[PDB]
Amino acid sequence: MEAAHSKSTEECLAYFGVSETTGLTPDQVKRHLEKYGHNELPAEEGKSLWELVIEQFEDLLVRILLLAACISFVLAWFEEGEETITAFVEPFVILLILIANAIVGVWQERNAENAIEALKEYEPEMGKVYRADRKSVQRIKARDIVPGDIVEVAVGDKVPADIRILSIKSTTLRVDQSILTGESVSVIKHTEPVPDPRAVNQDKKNMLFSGTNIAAGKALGIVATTGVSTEIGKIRDQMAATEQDKTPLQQKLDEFGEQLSKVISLICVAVWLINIGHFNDPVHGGSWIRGAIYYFKIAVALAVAAIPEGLPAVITTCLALGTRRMAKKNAIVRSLPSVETLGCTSVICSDKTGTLTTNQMSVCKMFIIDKVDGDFCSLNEFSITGSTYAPEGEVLKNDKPIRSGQFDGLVELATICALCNDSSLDFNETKGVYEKVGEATETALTTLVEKMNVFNTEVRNLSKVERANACNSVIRQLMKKEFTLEFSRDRKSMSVYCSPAKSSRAAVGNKMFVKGAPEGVIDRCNYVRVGTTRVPMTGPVKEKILSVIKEWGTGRDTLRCLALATRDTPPKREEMVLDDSSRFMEYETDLTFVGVVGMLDPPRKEVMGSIQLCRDAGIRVIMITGDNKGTAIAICRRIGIFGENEEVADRAYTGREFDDLPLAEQREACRRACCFARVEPSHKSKIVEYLQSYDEITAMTGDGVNDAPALKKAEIGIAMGSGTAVAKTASEMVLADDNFSTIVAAVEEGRAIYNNMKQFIRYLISSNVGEVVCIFLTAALGLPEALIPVQLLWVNLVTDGLPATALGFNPPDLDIMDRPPRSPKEPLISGWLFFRYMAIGGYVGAATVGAAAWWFMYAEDGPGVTYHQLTHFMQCTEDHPHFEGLDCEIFEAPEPMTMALSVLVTIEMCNALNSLSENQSLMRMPPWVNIWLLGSICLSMSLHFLILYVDPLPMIFKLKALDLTQWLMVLKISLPVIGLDEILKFIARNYLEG
Ligand SMILES: C/C=C(/C)C(=O)O[C@H]1C(C)=C2[C@H]([C@@H]1OC(=O)CCCCCCC)[C@@](C)(OC(C)=O)C[C@H](OC(=O)CCC)[C@@]1(O)[C@H]2OC(=O)[C@@]1(C)O
Ligand SMILES: Nc1ncnc2c1ncn2[C@@H]1O[C@H](COP(=O)(O)OP(=O)(O)OP(=O)(O)O)[C@H]2OC3(O[C@H]21)C([N+](=O)[O-])=CC(=[N+]([O-])O)C=C3[N+](=O)[O-]
Ligand SMILES: [Cl-]
Ligand SMILES: [K+]
Numbered sequence: 001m002e003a004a005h006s007k008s009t010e011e012c013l014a015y016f017g018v019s020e021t022t023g024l025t026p027d028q029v030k031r032h033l034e035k036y037g038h039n040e041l042p043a044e045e046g047k048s049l050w051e052l053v054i055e056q057f058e059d060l061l062v063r064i065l066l067l068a069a070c071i072s073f074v075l076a077w078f079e080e081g082e083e084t085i086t087a088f089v090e091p092f093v094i095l096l097i098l099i100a101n102a103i104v105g106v107w108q109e110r111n112a113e114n115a116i117e118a119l120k121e122y123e124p125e126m127g128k129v130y131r132a133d134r135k136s137v138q139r140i141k142a143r144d145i146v147p148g149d150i151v152e153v154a155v156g157d158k159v160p161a162d163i164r165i166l167s168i169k170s171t172t173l174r175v176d177q178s179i180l181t182g183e184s185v186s187v188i189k190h191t192e193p194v195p196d197p198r199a200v201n202q203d204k205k206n207m208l209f210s211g212t213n214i215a216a217g218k219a220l221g222i223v224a225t226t227g228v229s230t231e232i233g234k235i236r237d238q239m240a241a242t243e244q245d246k247t248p249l250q251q252k253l254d255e256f257g258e259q260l261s262k263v264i265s266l267i268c269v270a271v272w273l274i275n276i277g278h279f280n281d282p283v284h285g286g287s288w289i290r291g292a293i294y295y296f297k298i299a300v301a302l303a304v305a306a307i308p309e310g311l312p313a314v315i316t317t318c319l320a321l322g323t324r325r326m327a328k329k330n331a332i333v334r335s336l337p338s339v340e341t342l343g344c345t346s347v348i349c350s351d352k353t354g355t356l357t358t359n360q361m362s363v364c365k366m367f368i369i370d371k372v373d374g375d376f377c378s379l380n381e382f383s384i385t386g387s388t389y390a391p392e393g394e395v396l397k398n399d400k401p402i403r404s405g406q407f408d409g410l411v412e413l414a415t416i417c418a419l420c421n422d423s424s425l426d427f428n429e430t431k432g433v434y435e436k437v438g439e440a441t442e443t444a445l446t447t448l449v450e451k452m453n454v455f456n457t458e459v460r461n462l463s464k465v466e467r468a469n470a471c472n473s474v475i476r477q478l479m480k481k482e483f484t485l486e487f488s489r490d491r492k493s494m495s496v497y498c499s500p501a502k503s504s505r506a507a508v509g510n511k512m513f514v515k516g517a518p519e520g521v522i523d524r525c526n527y528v529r530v531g532t533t534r535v536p537m538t539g540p541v542k543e544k545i546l547s548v549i550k551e552w553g554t555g556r557d558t559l560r561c562l563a564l565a566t567r568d569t570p571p572k573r574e575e576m577v578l579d580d581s582s583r584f585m586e587y588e589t590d591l592t593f594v595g596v597v598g599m600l601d602p603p604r605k606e607v608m609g610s611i612q613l614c615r616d617a618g619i620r621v622i623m624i625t626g627d628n629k630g631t632a633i634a635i636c637r638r639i640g641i642f643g644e645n646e647e648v649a650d651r652a653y654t655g656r657e658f659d660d661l662p663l664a665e666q667r668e669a670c671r672r673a674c675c676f677a678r679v680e681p682s683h684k685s686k687i688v689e690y691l692q693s694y695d696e697i698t699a700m701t702g703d704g705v706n707d708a709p710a711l712k713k714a715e716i717g718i719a720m721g722s723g724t725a726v727a728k729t730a731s732e733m734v735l736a737d738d739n740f741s742t743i744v745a746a747v748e749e750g751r752a753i754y755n756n757m758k759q760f761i762r763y764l765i766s767s768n769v770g771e772v773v774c775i776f777l778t779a780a781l782g783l784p785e786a787l788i789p790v791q792l793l794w795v796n797l798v799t800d801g802l803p804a805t806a807l808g809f810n811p812p813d814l815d816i817m818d819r820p821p822r823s824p825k826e827p828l829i830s831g832w833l834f835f836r837y838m839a840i841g842g843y844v845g846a847a848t849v850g851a852a853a854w855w856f857m858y859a860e861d862g863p864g865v866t867y868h869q870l871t872h873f874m875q876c877t878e879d880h881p882h883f884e885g886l887d888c889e890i891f892e893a894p895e896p897m898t899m900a901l902s903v904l905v906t907i908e909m910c911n912a913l914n915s916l917s918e919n920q921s922l923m924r925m926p927p928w929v930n931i932w933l934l935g936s937i938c939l940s941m942s943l944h945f946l947i948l949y950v951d952p953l954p955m956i957f958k959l960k961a962l963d964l965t966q967w968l969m970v971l972k973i974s975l976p977v978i979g980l981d982e983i984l985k986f987i988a989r990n991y992l993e994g
């Protein structure tokens with residue numbers, strides 16, 4: 001029964017046809033269970049090994065390397081070489097990479113906790129129903145509750161299903177529905193119908209939504225919906241439905257994968273066309289099982305030359321150290337790939353209560369009477385600092401700290417605030433922070449009289465645990481609380497009867513202490529207290545009081561004003577009926593006005609500056625709240641979203657107002673409006689989707705259950721450390737310190753990290769370019785020598801993995817936060833950069849061929865002085881008279897591959913020096929600006945010497961030769977490549993402008 005809020009109690013009972021006094025019958029429970037199912041949110045399967053791993057293998061590049069590993073087993077089958085039969089282990093290496101990388105992804109998926117499971121902690125095990133079987137209430141399992149059941153709830157109870165209230169047994173029914181509205185304030189429900197069919201949960205003041213707990217009271221209702229059909233079930237559906245898109249940079253890697261598969265697949269067959277040298281090479285033989293293997297010997301090699309193996313390892317470690325660096329800023333990152341995505345955030349959506357504000361009700365202003373001389377009436381107004389329940393702060397008058405005990409009116413104001421109060425203030429030693437005990441509204445009064453200290457009580461050397469209620473107890477011991485007249489809806493106020501308990505009994509006179517909504521209380525105040533004295537209430541006086549109260553209720557500050565009064569001559573205790581709550585308003589008559597307090601959930605001190613910093617960084621901040629519109633706007637003015645006097649007309653909408661706009665006017669309404677109030681949990685997710693429709697990377701910040709959908713729909717979800725568990729589970733990052741400025745710091749770190757990522761990404765990709773060009777030249781000139789598939793792995797994994805990781809520690813740009821947010825879909829390589837890498841790739845790629853070619857043509861220690869016919873080395877066995885003065889094994893000497901690998905590694909170190917910047921020269925950018933860069937080059941070169949000057953590793957590859965005749969020649973290209981890139985870099989820095 002969805003329209004249950006708009007139908008009367010009798011109409012709701014008539015829908016299911018059950019008498020309010022008696023419960024459903026077993027037949028009805030059978031049928032309603034076979035129709036509506038059980039009352040439980042469905043679980044989620046989440047993970048599957050057999051399918052998660054294969055999903056990790058679904059990527060394209062891993063399909064290329066995987067397709068190359070088996071071929072590498074085929075090359076490994078070959079008994080031809082075996083001496084190099086033992087070197088058959090390259091595929092396993094090629095294999096052990098994939099496996100390893102795969103596992104890392106699985107590990108990233110290992111931490112994915114079930115957020116629906118966290119949402120299921122808000123459904124209770126047992127529930128209380130009345131039924132036909134038994135006159136006495138039945139405590140059953142809440143999952144067996146079907147619609148139509150008569151359900152009972154009491155204090156502390158968790159509501160099991162969405163329930164229309166039939167009769168409230170207590171004076172009031174206060175429910176904490178922060179699960180859906182994000183507000184710790186407890187709403188006062190009723191049984192009247194709510195005619196609006198499209199009312200939001202905040203307006204359904206006659207319903208009891210599943211997952212919310214009863215703050216105080218006892219009531220009876222009939223169940224409307226169960227299971228997924230409840231309002232929390234909408235949250236579950238929206239949390240299982242919103243799939244997370246791939247990281248923008250990850251999308252770049254994927255399309256790079258596609259084009260890479262195209263280019264590899266086209267080159268491998270493109271070699272078949274240039275087969276002028278394959279028409280008739282052997283003396284009689286042709287293409288058989290031995291001959292065709294060449295077309296694969298290049299293939300796998302070409303693959304390992306194109307695939308940047310180890311890039312996921314480098315980005316994984318880089319993002320890991322980013323997580324460690326932000327961890328010192330109290331920013332716990334749950335998803336590694338999200339860090340990058342935080343840099344390019346264009347819009348930040350944010351909750352208010354608990355996120356932008358402290359979620360701790362604080363009394364800002366207060367006023368008492370000063371002088372009453374005829375029509376004139378002056379007031380004493382005070383402001384109170386402190387934005388938390390902790391008794392920290394002082395009272396001020398005209399921006400000057402003043403002791404409260406000097407004003408006789410403030411003493412009585414604190415006396416009313418302390419006695420007429422059911423709440424206490426506790427100090428959590430485990431969390432190390434003061435927590436409210438009771439309602440937030442009254443707790444604000446408790447901490448208020450803690451801040452005031454009207455009797456000048458020594459509280460400096462007090463323990464932090466006893467500091468919580470130090471002054472409240474002082475006031476409690478002065479007047480004994482006989483009984484309390486509880487809050488009722490008819491009079492919108494509550495009162496307390498107190499006796500002196502003084503030295504001489506109650507001869508000083510009993511007094512009644514009343515607090516409540518302003519108009520209803522002031523209308524019953526026939527007297528006004530001026531310090532110690534009492535004067536009759538008049539027109540001009542109450543017009544001044546109501547004037548100031550109206551000035552505080554609206555405008556810049558939007559405080560919740562409570563009026564406080566006493567009764568100097570209350571009636572006798574033996575003539576007050578305490579059962580009938582409607583009579584209490586007569587008991588609270590003939591009052592004496594005292595003062596007024598103003599409450600507000602104040603913002604965190606760290607927020608406003610953060611909003612200015614995002615504004616400076618081109619990031620717009622949007623507030624999305626379940627709280628009232630006036631309150632959210634008044635907070636926006638303090639935060640810096642709106643001006644102190646800015647007219648907010650078309651810039652702030654409510655969920656009901658938002659839904660009334662055409663879908664177009666909503667999608668465009670998210671571009672201008674910066675504040676959204678009184679919204680349902682679905683509305684936040686809808687706004688996030690709308691902002692993402694503009695291809696804008698948006699981030700959501702929250703702390704409650706109602707923020708869970710948005711937190712999933714946003715590209716980056718940021719949860720508060722003091723927030724709910726379900727909000728943390730559906731987020732990519734947590735702020736343990738609850739500070740809002742660490743978001744700004746986190747964005748800065750993300751941008752700097754990406755700026756450092758383009759560097760080593762371009763480095764590895766360029767090395768792959770040179771390798772591809774080299775394998776192509778060696779393939780077209782018939783010289784598979786000087787390169788092997790095994791070594792290209794170690795080069796792209798170890799000797800290049802270290803400098804690439806070192807590039808992650810480059811100093812960030814100075815004016816990095818004065819620039820607007822980065823474009824989402826923009827290439828890492830542009831035309832000029834693509835031209836630069838296209839030239840240097842063929843240059844350094846031809847270097848590696850020139851190593852072997854030079855070792856054979858112009859060399860004093862290279863016996864293979866062939867001079868000509870070097871390209872036709874395969875004929876050496878069938879045309880031995882052609883190749884005299886040498887052995888058939890000299891073609892595969894250790895020096896060609898040692899020199900090719902040498903110029904490769906050195907060109908890669910110098911190229912890693914070129915990767916320190918894109919448009920900045922090396923003369924103005926000293927290489928020692930990054931100690932980790934030169935350190936990684938020193939360690940990669942040291943590991944290269946370890947490859948050469950050892951016994952195992954050479955057996956796979958080749959043997960090293962002397963240096964008096966070898967390193968002198970590696971400098972033909974190992975060093976002038978820096979000059980090439982230096983000219984190419986000098987051109988665009990000056991020729992581009994003018
Ligand atoms: C040589 C090595 C490989 C892996 C390769 O083919 O990379 C190309 C390639 C797929 C791209 C190109 C490479 O283009 C070339 O190779 C130039 C001509 C072909 C030479 C072959 C014979 C001499 C990248 C490498 O060119 C450079 C950097 O010079 C940059 C970039 O990729 C990036 O955005 C950088 C990494 C994400 C992509 O053009 C990309 O394709 C796209 O769709 C892009 C837009 O992405
Ligand atoms: N944004 C807020 N900031 C501060 N307080 C809020 C806020 N919203 C609600 N409250 C308090 O919570 C109680 C719940 O009332 P409820 O009907 O949910 O809200 P509203 O009255 O604002 O109506 P609305 O939903 O906006 O139409 C009110 O009762 C009282 O103070 C109010 C109240 N009053 O409103 O007059 C009197 C009172 N005593 O004791 O006199 C005690 C309250 N209380 O404990 O919550
Ligand atoms: Cl509102
Ligand atoms: K998310």
Ligand SMILES: [Mg+2]
Pocket residue numbers: 182351352353354355702703704
């Ligand atoms: Mg919140």
Ligand SMILES: [Mg+2]
Pocket residue numbers: 628
């Ligand atoms: Mg309200």
